[PDB]
């Protein structure tokens with residue numbers, strides 16, 4: 001989106017929404033982008049996903065201070081992998097309340113990650129139990145079922161055409177589903193489709209590892225995941 005701050009990139013997606021992007025050198029893959037979101041809700045800022053590292057995550061907070069200059073109220077993190085929860089310490093150090101799927105917090109220690117302070121639980125229909133997501137504002141949080149990981153969750157932003165698939169969703173031209181080490185091969189395809197069904201009005205699909213795409217990204221992803229079963 002062209003805003004470069006330190007080693008991160010910030011792209012405005014809507015008047016109150018930005019994508020944050022951080023990079024990690026992974027031999028044999030290159031310098032790998034990971035995307036999250038920043039949302040302004042009135043007088044506060046909400047964050048979706050950390051950067052890969054604590055330092056990068058501190059940089060996200062520095063950008064927010066400089067460009068928005070409102071307090072960060074809370075952060076929700078999609079799953080227990082380094083690109084989504086690598087920077088938990090920086091959020092906690094800043095006094096930011098953090099939230100994750102209960103299962104993500106249970107998985108975090110063995111993954112070498114810090115758990116969020118708070119656990120989300122999910123209803124029958126996959127939607128977050130409201131009582132476990134206080135003050136989430138426009139963030140609508142949905143568990144689509146196991147896919148990229150057992151614990152992967154997704155987030156739509158109310159008042160926008162934006163839904164965030166995290167690492168569940170790949171772009172419409174992706175040549176693979178990327179990392180499948182912790183993937184649920186049987187359930188991935190249905191979980192990807194369920195994400196689309198939860199946010200039917202979303203025309204902009206934000207994801208971890210490619211620039212924002214149309215709903216064709218969901219279509220393409222589920223079709224790749226089909227070949228896993």
Ligand SMILES: [Zn+2]
Pocket residue numbers: 079080081148149167179
């Ligand atoms: Zn992951």
Ligand SMILES: [Zn+2]
Pocket residue numbers: 034081083167208209
């Ligand atoms: Zn990822």
